[PDB]
Write a protein that binds this DNA or RNA. Structure first.
Ligand SMILES: [Mg+2]
Ligand SMILES: [Mg+2]
Ligand SMILES: [Mg+2]
Ligand SMILES: [Mg+2]
Ligand SMILES: [Mg+2]
Ligand SMILES: [Mg+2]
Ligand SMILES: [Mg+2]
Ligand SMILES: [Mg+2]
Ligand SMILES: [Mg+2]
Ligand SMILES: [Mg+2]
Ligand SMILES: [Mg+2]
Ligand SMILES: [Mg+2]
Ligand SMILES: [Mg+2]
Ligand SMILES: [Mg+2]
Ligand SMILES: [Mg+2]
Ligand SMILES: [Mg+2]
Ligand SMILES: [Mg+2]
Ligand SMILES: [Mg+2]
Ligand SMILES: [Mg+2]
Ligand SMILES: [Mg+2]
Ligand SMILES: [Mg+2]
Ligand SMILES: [Mg+2]
Ligand SMILES: [Mg+2]
Ligand SMILES: [Mg+2]
Ligand SMILES: [Mg+2]
Ligand SMILES: [Mg+2]
Ligand SMILES: [Mg+2]
Ligand SMILES: [Mg+2]
Ligand SMILES: [Mg+2]
Ligand SMILES: [Mg+2]
Ligand SMILES: [Mg+2]
Ligand SMILES: [Mg+2]
Ligand SMILES: [Mg+2]
Ligand SMILES: [Mg+2]
Ligand SMILES: [Mg+2]
Ligand SMILES: [Mg+2]
Ligand SMILES: [Mg+2]
Ligand SMILES: [Mg+2]
Ligand SMILES: [Mg+2]
Ligand SMILES: [Mg+2]
Ligand SMILES: [Mg+2]
Ligand SMILES: [Mg+2]
Ligand SMILES: [Mg+2]
Ligand SMILES: [Mg+2]
Ligand SMILES: [Mg+2]
Ligand SMILES: [Mg+2]
Ligand SMILES: [Mg+2]
Ligand SMILES: [Mg+2]
Ligand SMILES: [Mg+2]
Ligand SMILES: [Mg+2]
Ligand SMILES: [Mg+2]
Ligand SMILES: [Mg+2]
Ligand SMILES: [Mg+2]
Ligand SMILES: [Mg+2]
Ligand SMILES: [Mg+2]
Ligand SMILES: [Mg+2]
Ligand SMILES: [Mg+2]
Ligand SMILES: [Mg+2]
Ligand SMILES: [Mg+2]
Ligand SMILES: [Mg+2]
Ligand SMILES: [Mg+2]
Ligand SMILES: [Mg+2]
Ligand SMILES: [Mg+2]
Ligand SMILES: [Mg+2]
Ligand SMILES: [Mg+2]
Ligand SMILES: [Mg+2]
Ligand SMILES: [Mg+2]
Ligand SMILES: [Mg+2]
Ligand SMILES: [Mg+2]
Ligand SMILES: [Mg+2]
Ligand SMILES: [Mg+2]
Ligand SMILES: [Mg+2]
Ligand SMILES: [Mg+2]
Ligand SMILES: [Mg+2]
Ligand SMILES: [Mg+2]
Ligand SMILES: [Mg+2]
Ligand SMILES: [Mg+2]
Ligand SMILES: [Mg+2]
Ligand SMILES: [Mg+2]
Ligand SMILES: [Mg+2]
Ligand SMILES: [Mg+2]
Ligand SMILES: [Mg+2]
Ligand SMILES: [Mg+2]
Ligand SMILES: [Mg+2]
Ligand SMILES: [Mg+2]
Ligand SMILES: [Mg+2]
Ligand SMILES: [Mg+2]
Ligand SMILES: [Mg+2]
Ligand SMILES: [Mg+2]
Ligand SMILES: [Mg+2]
Ligand SMILES: [Mg+2]
Ligand SMILES: [Mg+2]
Ligand SMILES: [Mg+2]
Ligand SMILES: [Mg+2]
Ligand SMILES: [Mg+2]
Ligand SMILES: [Mg+2]
Ligand SMILES: [Mg+2]
Ligand SMILES: [Mg+2]
Ligand SMILES: [Mg+2]
Ligand SMILES: [Mg+2]
Ligand SMILES: [Mg+2]
Ligand SMILES: [Mg+2]
Ligand SMILES: [Mg+2]
Ligand SMILES: [Mg+2]
Ligand SMILES: [Mg+2]
Ligand SMILES: [Mg+2]
Ligand SMILES: [Mg+2]
Ligand SMILES: [Mg+2]
Ligand SMILES: [Mg+2]
Ligand SMILES: [Mg+2]
Ligand SMILES: [Mg+2]
Ligand SMILES: [Mg+2]
Ligand SMILES: [Mg+2]
Ligand SMILES: [Mg+2]
Ligand SMILES: [Mg+2]
Ligand SMILES: [Mg+2]
Ligand SMILES: [Mg+2]
Ligand SMILES: [Mg+2]
Ligand SMILES: [Mg+2]
Ligand SMILES: [Mg+2]
Ligand SMILES: [Mg+2]
Ligand SMILES: [Mg+2]
Ligand SMILES: [Mg+2]
Ligand SMILES: [Mg+2]
Ligand SMILES: [Mg+2]
Ligand SMILES: [Mg+2]
Ligand SMILES: [Mg+2]
Ligand SMILES: [Mg+2]
Ligand SMILES: [Mg+2]
Ligand SMILES: [Mg+2]
Ligand SMILES: [Mg+2]
Ligand SMILES: [Mg+2]
Ligand SMILES: [Mg+2]
Ligand SMILES: [Mg+2]
Ligand SMILES: [Mg+2]
Ligand SMILES: [Mg+2]
Ligand SMILES: [Mg+2]
Ligand SMILES: [Mg+2]
Ligand SMILES: [Mg+2]
Ligand SMILES: [Mg+2]
Ligand SMILES: [Mg+2]
Ligand SMILES: [Mg+2]
Ligand SMILES: [Mg+2]
Ligand SMILES: [Mg+2]
Ligand SMILES: [Mg+2]
Ligand SMILES: [Mg+2]
Ligand SMILES: [Mg+2]
Ligand SMILES: [Mg+2]
Ligand SMILES: [Mg+2]
Ligand SMILES: [Mg+2]
Ligand SMILES: [Mg+2]
Ligand SMILES: [Mg+2]
Ligand SMILES: [Mg+2]
Ligand SMILES: [Mg+2]
Ligand SMILES: [Mg+2]
Ligand SMILES: [Mg+2]
Ligand SMILES: [Mg+2]
Ligand SMILES: [Mg+2]
Ligand SMILES: [Mg+2]
Ligand SMILES: [Mg+2]
Ligand SMILES: [Mg+2]
Ligand SMILES: [Mg+2]
Ligand SMILES: [Mg+2]
Ligand SMILES: [Mg+2]
Ligand SMILES: [Mg+2]
Ligand SMILES: [Mg+2]
Ligand SMILES: [Mg+2]
Ligand SMILES: [Mg+2]
Ligand SMILES: [Mg+2]
Ligand SMILES: [Mg+2]
Ligand SMILES: [Mg+2]
Ligand SMILES: [Mg+2]
Ligand SMILES: [Mg+2]
Ligand SMILES: [Mg+2]
Ligand SMILES: [Mg+2]
Ligand SMILES: [Mg+2]
Ligand SMILES: [Mg+2]
Ligand SMILES: [Mg+2]
Ligand SMILES: [Mg+2]
Ligand SMILES: [Mg+2]
Ligand SMILES: [Mg+2]
Ligand SMILES: [Mg+2]
Ligand SMILES: [Mg+2]
Ligand SMILES: [Mg+2]
Ligand SMILES: [Mg+2]
Ligand SMILES: [Mg+2]
Ligand SMILES: [Mg+2]
Ligand SMILES: [Mg+2]
Ligand SMILES: [Mg+2]
Ligand SMILES: [Zn+2]
Lengths: 208, 99, 99, 83
RNA sequence: UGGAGAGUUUGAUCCUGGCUCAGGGUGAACGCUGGCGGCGUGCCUAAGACAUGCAAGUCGUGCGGGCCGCGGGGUUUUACUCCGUGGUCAGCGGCGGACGGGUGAGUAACGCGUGGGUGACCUACCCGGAAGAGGGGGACAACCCGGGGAAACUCGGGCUAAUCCCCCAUGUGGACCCGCCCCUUGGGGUGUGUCCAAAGGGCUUUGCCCGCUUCCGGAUGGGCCCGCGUCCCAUCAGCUAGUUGGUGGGGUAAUGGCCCACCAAGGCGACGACGGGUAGCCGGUCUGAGAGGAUGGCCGGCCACAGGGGCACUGAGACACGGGCCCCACUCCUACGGGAGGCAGCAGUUAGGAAUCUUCCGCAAUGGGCGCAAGCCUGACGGAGCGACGCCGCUUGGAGGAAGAAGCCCUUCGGGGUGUAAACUCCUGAACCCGGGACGAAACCCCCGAGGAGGGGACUGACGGUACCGGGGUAAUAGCGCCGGCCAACUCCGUGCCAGCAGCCGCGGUAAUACGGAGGGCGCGAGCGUUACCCGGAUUCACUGGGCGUAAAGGGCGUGUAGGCGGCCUGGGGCGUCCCAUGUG
RNA sequence: AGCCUACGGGCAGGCGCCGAGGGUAGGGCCCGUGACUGGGGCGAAGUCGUAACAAGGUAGCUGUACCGGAAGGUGCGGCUGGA
């Protein structure tokens, strides 16, 4: 399960506009522009000097929350990042970004990474023609992330394309709104993503 | 409840007897030989030895005494029969022995 | 190949048998330092040739007896009682232990 | 006798087989003399079969009654074929 | 591609030092909660006792016979029997029951692991090479007759068949004594003497097939032997009569004190013998930066055992789990004379325990046995069932929506929090329904060709109306731990050294962020916590990698045995050490 | 003395060795338990003294010895961790 509970409460924890809503998060608030302080009756009192733990902890709290992913699947990836020979820090993120429920978001078929998961599990998506409803699907390079045939005509699908018109998309990605398809070009480099998280802390926290 | 493995048991009993019979006559015959072999006889000390050396290999055909265990019996037999005669005798009657 | 090793004879008492003491060097599997241990094998000497203090080669061989599974391959030298010294004195000290 | 036959591998419902020479008395998935070739019973790839025909001729040469449905996979690889 | 530390001895300080926590793991169990699937996995305890069902048979192309059914007659006709054929039942005979499947009791051992040895050995069935099958004779079951017995079974009497038993011949060959050469542990050849072979059956019968006998080789599977490796106690220090070796014998497939007679006086031990305790061992597995430690469940290999113990028979092979005999314990039958039984095989039951599954489906697939084949058996196996036990995937919605409902909580009474959360609008459409619906299965078999190589053709699916596909379609389970420090998430009230908390330091004696409830918050999420045990942290047995003036720790001092260690130059050998190759792993 | 025989032998049976285990006797190790007794640990408040830490009000500690309700005291040496 995802954080089916209130979403805008999370942003209010790192004092950072966590983009996880859609139309609203660009309105006058990710819930943010009116309440730049943590939930609960407290919070808006004099904040506490965060310990080395507090920080490294909550840094990891962002990165995960950002993709609406479970701790289970999450650390399995980080560990897997550790296995393959390379810069674990960034490598993680690339694997983290190869998520199908996330690629559809980056391709903009979906307003949020959450809406993206729903559309995906609902099979409205497809890779290289074949259908796929597994939001965890590891998206390979050269794979065609297309919208399913009977799915194209849908209104919600169109509206998200009526917003992806002209406006650019990931440098490791190609849109093609005409064919209503898309394309996963290459695993992103560190810079190509602009997550509010210092990935080095997230590694540190994974040592206890 | 009653596996017809009995057929195997009843058979072995018949087997047991045959081998028991072939085997025992082997032993009692060999004894006649060694007795006479030392007793100076040879006109028949060897004659008896033949029926032995025979009955061994014949039993060897069957599942009774088998393998080189047939050979041992023969070796440890005539090998000693010959020597028992070396107590004065010389290879008389044409026993299974070459001079 | 039939395993072989050299060692000092250190017992001539037995009939047609001798005791060979053989050392072997090897590093401690956790503490490196090369260490020496020894063992006594019962060698078959049919000719009663080899005597005490002999350094000899022995060979893995057909079982001669309960403990004898080797044969004296060949001599290496005679004067070596100096080693028999250390072995005997080792056995000397055991006295000064059990109470 | 020594026989040439198949041995199960791959998960449940997803069978595979190692065409192999082992003693008839051996267990099926048990230790075997030598693996010659695999075989997918469902052909989930282009490589749904294979046989080290070099040594296969050998074992039949030194006598090694293979299974029936083991002989089958040998005819397809045509170890017996000669012309 | 790998290594983090914290709390606690003081008034405070540095150091030593123990305790304690955060991590990972499990065949787990317990509590609270619990939606769907996939692959795994599930008596660790009493190797305690088990109702019932099934778990090893097969060949009529080895042989005669009881029975039942089909067709015919030998006979001019007939008793009826002969003859042909199918089925069934046993018997005789052959192959398999020593594989497969279960368990860890025992075992500190050449049991296991690893590398070798056998001139000291065996090997059913399969593969290659050579040679051969001539003649003659016999017994016992079935069946018939008579008896004893409750039963289980059994005694006697009479026939008979065969690939069953036996004698004579042919001896390609092989076995043995002795002699010779080669080689050199019992390896190969040769000579005289002697010893041993064979079984028939089927069809399309002048021939092909399945078998039979001897011998050599191959392949495979073993026996035995050896170097080295394999737990704690030294408050176990000495041990030993088949004991150590020898000569000759017995036994085996084969070496050996395995076993025996005779002789010699030896064998083992601080490099830990003997004894005691514990334990199946390994590939591997858990942890660790690694070295190291811990472990051996499922899986594969090896060993051991089949209620305890002993024994041999049959056999190529066994001391044989669903074979045999004997003793002990236990269960049942009994006509009291006697007799039957062995789940540590698959299910299932009972006992014990914190705890561990359906008395399911099927030989369709793979594998094994028998058979010419058809085929027969197969609780090996292929599947399904039950249990969050583990790992993985997935769902309980998505977008919008107030300067913010009611409720509940806090308040300096201005306000703040829950909270975009809900309500609300829209969208998608787990479940449920409709239609279609497998992969796993081409071979044995049939025709052409030769029954060969090659080709063509046909039957067969337990799971399963299952997976998957298409169509229609409802917003549709959230729980647990924590919130003083370590460790991170704060306020209100009740309580008053009482009630209670607790892993450590400690908290409570009427103002508790430490007890209980609430509001709120943090961490996880179909799980969350607890107990137990292992590694970690512990660099706290320190080889990597520790110390002994006062913190625990130098022997009261000497002499010296074994062991450990060892100066400068040259040379030989090449054990350690180093490198290459190869076999093995 | 029985049985079979192709009479050369075989089976049955008898005896002997060894033999599961049963019995008797004497040893060894380990576990449980035992009137009573010996010290040890733990304790929020008891009785008696005040031995130690300051010249602890007799410097302390120590091996040994003797003695005393109890800490302890004293003799003989030793140490400084006393002066
Ligand atoms: Mg949830
Ligand atoms: Mg690199
Ligand atoms: Mg006999
Ligand atoms: Mg007699
Ligand atoms: Mg006799
Ligand atoms: Mg001689
Ligand atoms: Mg001996
Ligand atoms: Mg000897
Ligand atoms: Mg003593
Ligand atoms: Mg790496
Ligand atoms: Mg740490
Ligand atoms: Mg402390
Ligand atoms: Mg304290
Ligand atoms: Mg102190
Ligand atoms: Mg303090
Ligand atoms: Mg500490
Ligand atoms: Mg940790
Ligand atoms: Mg449980
Ligand atoms: Mg329960
Ligand atoms: Mg509980
Ligand atoms: Mg419960
Ligand atoms: Mg519940
Ligand atoms: Mg559930
Ligand atoms: Mg699944
Ligand atoms: Mg299934
Ligand atoms: Mg049981
Ligand atoms: Mg039943
Ligand atoms: Mg019939
Ligand atoms: Mg038939
Ligand atoms: Mg036949
Ligand atoms: Mg008949
Ligand atoms: Mg009939
Ligand atoms: Mg009938
Ligand atoms: Mg008629
Ligand atoms: Mg007929
Ligand atoms: Mg059987
Ligand atoms: Mg059997
Ligand atoms: Mg076996
Ligand atoms: Mg022991
Ligand atoms: Mg070995
Ligand atoms: Mg091994
Ligand atoms: Mg067999
Ligand atoms: Mg055959
Ligand atoms: Mg074979
Ligand atoms: Mg053959
Ligand atoms: Mg041929
Ligand atoms: Mg005949
Ligand atoms: Mg006659
Ligand atoms: Mg006749
Ligand atoms: Mg009667
Ligand atoms: Mg009657
Ligand atoms: Mg009766
Ligand atoms: Mg009769
Ligand atoms: Mg009769
Ligand atoms: Mg002739
Ligand atoms: Mg002949
Ligand atoms: Mg000849
Ligand atoms: Mg010839
Ligand atoms: Mg000469
Ligand atoms: Mg030669
Ligand atoms: Mg003849
Ligand atoms: Mg014949
Ligand atoms: Mg015959
Ligand atoms: Mg014929
Ligand atoms: Mg051979
Ligand atoms: Mg071979
Ligand atoms: Mg071998
Ligand atoms: Mg060793
Ligand atoms: Mg010890
Ligand atoms: Mg003594
Ligand atoms: Mg003694
Ligand atoms: Mg003796
Ligand atoms: Mg001997
Ligand atoms: Mg002995
Ligand atoms: Mg001897
Ligand atoms: Mg003796
Ligand atoms: Mg000793
Ligand atoms: Mg020891
Ligand atoms: Mg020791
Ligand atoms: Mg002990
Ligand atoms: Mg055990
Ligand atoms: Mg390393
Ligand atoms: Mg280890
Ligand atoms: Mg088990
Ligand atoms: Mg498994
Ligand atoms: Mg196992
Ligand atoms: Mg046993
Ligand atoms: Mg038993
Ligand atoms: Mg057999
Ligand atoms: Mg035999
Ligand atoms: Mg044998
Ligand atoms: Mg046994
Ligand atoms: Mg056995
Ligand atoms: Mg058996
Ligand atoms: Mg038995
Ligand atoms: Mg059993
Ligand atoms: Mg059984
Ligand atoms: Mg009872
Ligand atoms: Mg009865
Ligand atoms: Mg019965
Ligand atoms: Mg059972
Ligand atoms: Mg109970
Ligand atoms: Mg059926
Ligand atoms: Mg089958
Ligand atoms: Mg099948
Ligand atoms: Mg089967
Ligand atoms: Mg199920
Ligand atoms: Mg279930
Ligand atoms: Mg549970
Ligand atoms: Mg899961
Ligand atoms: Mg919503
Ligand atoms: Mg507001
Ligand atoms: Mg409100
Ligand atoms: Mg309410
Ligand atoms: Mg407030
Ligand atoms: Mg307040
Ligand atoms: Mg919403
Ligand atoms: Mg809420
Ligand atoms: Mg509408
Ligand atoms: Mg639809
Ligand atoms: Mg239909
Ligand atoms: Mg098919
Ligand atoms: Mg097909
Ligand atoms: Mg096939
Ligand atoms: Mg034809
Ligand atoms: Mg073709
Ligand atoms: Mg067909
Ligand atoms: Mg067809
Ligand atoms: Mg079908
Ligand atoms: Mg089916
Ligand atoms: Mg649908
Ligand atoms: Mg529709
Ligand atoms: Mg719908
Ligand atoms: Mg709802
Ligand atoms: Mg729910
Ligand atoms: Mg929960
Ligand atoms: Mg917690
Ligand atoms: Mg709390
Ligand atoms: Mg108040
Ligand atoms: Mg209150
Ligand atoms: Mg109130
Ligand atoms: Mg209280
Ligand atoms: Mg609590
Ligand atoms: Mg207080
Ligand atoms: Mg209060
Ligand atoms: Mg607490
Ligand atoms: Mg309440
Ligand atoms: Mg709450
Ligand atoms: Mg969670
Ligand atoms: Mg827990
Ligand atoms: Mg514990
Ligand atoms: Mg530990
Ligand atoms: Mg320490
Ligand atoms: Mg410690
Ligand atoms: Mg101490
Ligand atoms: Mg000290
Ligand atoms: Mg000193
Ligand atoms: Mg000294
Ligand atoms: Mg002293
Ligand atoms: Mg030199
Ligand atoms: Mg080396
Ligand atoms: Mg190598
Ligand atoms: Mg008798
Ligand atoms: Mg006697
Ligand atoms: Mg006795
Ligand atoms: Mg006794
Ligand atoms: Mg008795
Ligand atoms: Mg009694
Ligand atoms: Mg006694
Ligand atoms: Mg006592
Ligand atoms: Mg006591
Ligand atoms: Mg006292
Ligand atoms: Mg004490
Ligand atoms: Mg008090
Ligand atoms: Mg007091
Ligand atoms: Mg004083
Ligand atoms: Mg005082
Ligand atoms: Mg004074
Ligand atoms: Mg004083
Ligand atoms: Mg004083
Ligand atoms: Mg003092
Ligand atoms: Mg002292
Ligand atoms: Mg004192
Ligand atoms: Mg005095
Ligand atoms: Mg002094
Ligand atoms: Mg002084
Ligand atoms: Mg002084
Ligand atoms: Mg002074
Ligand atoms: Mg002064
Ligand atoms: Zn937002």
């Amino acid at each position: 399960g995802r954080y089916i509970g209130p979403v805008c409460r999370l942003c209010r924890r790192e004092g950072v506009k966590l983009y996880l809503k859609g139309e609203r998060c660009y309105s006058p608030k990710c819930a943010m522009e009116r309440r730049p302080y943590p939930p609960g009756q407290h919070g808006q009192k004099r904040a506490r000097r965060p310990s080395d733990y507090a920080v490294r902890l909550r840094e990891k709290q962002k990165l995960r929350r950002i993709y609406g992913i479970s701790e289970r699947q999450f650390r399995n990836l980080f560990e897997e990042a550790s296995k393959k020979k390379g810069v674990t820090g960034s490598v993680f993120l690339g694997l983290l970004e190869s998520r199908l429920d996330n690629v559809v978001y980056r391709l903009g078929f979906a307003v949020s990474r959450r809406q993206a998961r729903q559309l995906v599990r609902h099979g409205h998506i497809t890779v290289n023609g074949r259908r796929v409803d597994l939001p965890s699907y590891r998206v390979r390079p050269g794979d065609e992330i297309a919208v399913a045939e009977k799915s194209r005509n849908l209104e919600l699908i169109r509206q998200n394309l009526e917003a992806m018109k002209g406006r650019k998309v990931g440098p490791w990605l190609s849109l093609d709104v005409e064919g209503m398809k898309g394309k996963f070009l290459r695993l992103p480099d560190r810079e190509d993503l602009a997550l509010p998280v210092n990935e080095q802390l997230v590694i540190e926290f994974y040592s206890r | 409840r009653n596996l017809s493995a009995l057929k195997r048991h009843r058979q072995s009993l018949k087997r047991r007897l045959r081998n028991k019979a072939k085997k025992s006559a082997i032993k009692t015959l060999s004894k006649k030989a060694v007795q006479l072999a030392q007793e100076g006889k040879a006109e028949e000390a060897l004659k008896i030895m033949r029926k032995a050396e025979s009955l061994i290999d014949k039993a060897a055909k069957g599942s009774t005494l088998h393998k080189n265990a047939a050979a041992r019996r023969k070796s440890r037999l005539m090998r000693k029969v010959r020597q028992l005669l070396e107590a004065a005798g010389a290879p008389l009657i044409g026993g299974g022995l070459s001079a | 190949p039939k395993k072989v090793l050299t060692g000092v004879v250190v017992s001539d008492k037995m009939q047609k048998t001798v005791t060979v003491l053989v050392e072997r060097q090897f590093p401690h599997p956790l503490y490196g330092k090369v260490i020496k241990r020894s063992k006594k094998y019962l060698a078959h000497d049919p000719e009663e040739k080899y005597k005490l203090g002999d350094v000899v080669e022995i060979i893995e061989s057909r079982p001669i007896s309960k403990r004898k599974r080797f044969r004296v391959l060949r001599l290496v030298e005679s004067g070596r009682m100096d080693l028999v010294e250390k072995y005997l004195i080792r056995r000397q000290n055991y006295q000064s232990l059990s109470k | 006798m020594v026989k040439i036959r198949l041995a199960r591998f791959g998960s449940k419902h997803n069978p595979h087989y190692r065409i192999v020479v082992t003693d008839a008395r051996r267990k099926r998935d048990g230790k075997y003399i030598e693996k010659i070739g695999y075989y997918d019973p469902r052909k989930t790839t282009p490589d749904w079969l294979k046989v080290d025909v070099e040594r296969a001729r050998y074992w039949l040469s030194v006598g090694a009654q293979p299974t029936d449905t083991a002989r089958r996979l040998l005819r397809q690889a045509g170890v017996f074929r000669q012309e």
